[PDB]
Symmetry: C4
Subunit: 70 residues, 4 copies
């Protein structure tokens, strides 16, 4: 009765992993499918500053003052 209990639990351990392996794979396929943070942050920061480096050179506030200056 001893050996069978060991046989049962051993079979269960070995089975148990295969769904554990499926999960570890999913975590590695998930980590290696996203972009790095520093590359992502540069690209969006560079977009914020570009969009604003343009509107500030746009000089929206020049009009009304040039209206009064004629």
């Amino acid at each position: 009765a001893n050996l069978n209990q060991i046989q049962k639990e051993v079979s269960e351990i070995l089975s148990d992993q295969k769904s554990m392996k499926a999960d570890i794979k999913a975590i590695l396929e998930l980590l290696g499918s996203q972009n790095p943070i520093k590359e992502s942050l540069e690209t969006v920061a560079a977009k914020i500053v570009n969009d604003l480096t343009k509107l500030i050179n746009d000089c929206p506030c020049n009009k009304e003052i040039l209206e009064a200056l004629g």
Copy 2:
């Protein structure tokens, strides 16, 4: 040395692995909950640029200058 000890050992492995399976599941259900960084950035970066666009297009500094020019803003 003996089958009795092996049995405790085997049971202990089994138990701990069960715990580990659940703990691994959690890691996955928590890297999975974390939604795209590349999508979260774009939405916030739009909100930053929108706000500061509203401010600039308000021309806060014209009031002082139009005052000197004798014209209402």
Copy 3:
């Protein structure tokens, strides 16, 4: 034959041990940081507030008022 089974089984255990410690480390790392949406909001707010303060503080106006004839 129970010697070899005992040696393997101890080595399975000893490894689960180190495995355990790593999952713990992974769960601590992930579990201990602000949601991505939360951390991006405080930074964004930081930026706007840092830039509003400068803009509202009207830096370029004195050069104009000087040229206009004021001071």
Copy 4:
């Protein structure tokens, strides 16, 4: 029964060695990276500093002073 068990045990041990190495690597990866809140502070300060460069420069004064 016994040789059966000795084989599943070898199989558990070997299959686990690969799991433990992948787990170590998951950790390796979440280490290679510096905290998200830590990298956002740095990229934020350059965003403001360089628009600070732009605004303090007064790109909109040239057109006003030309009328004065």
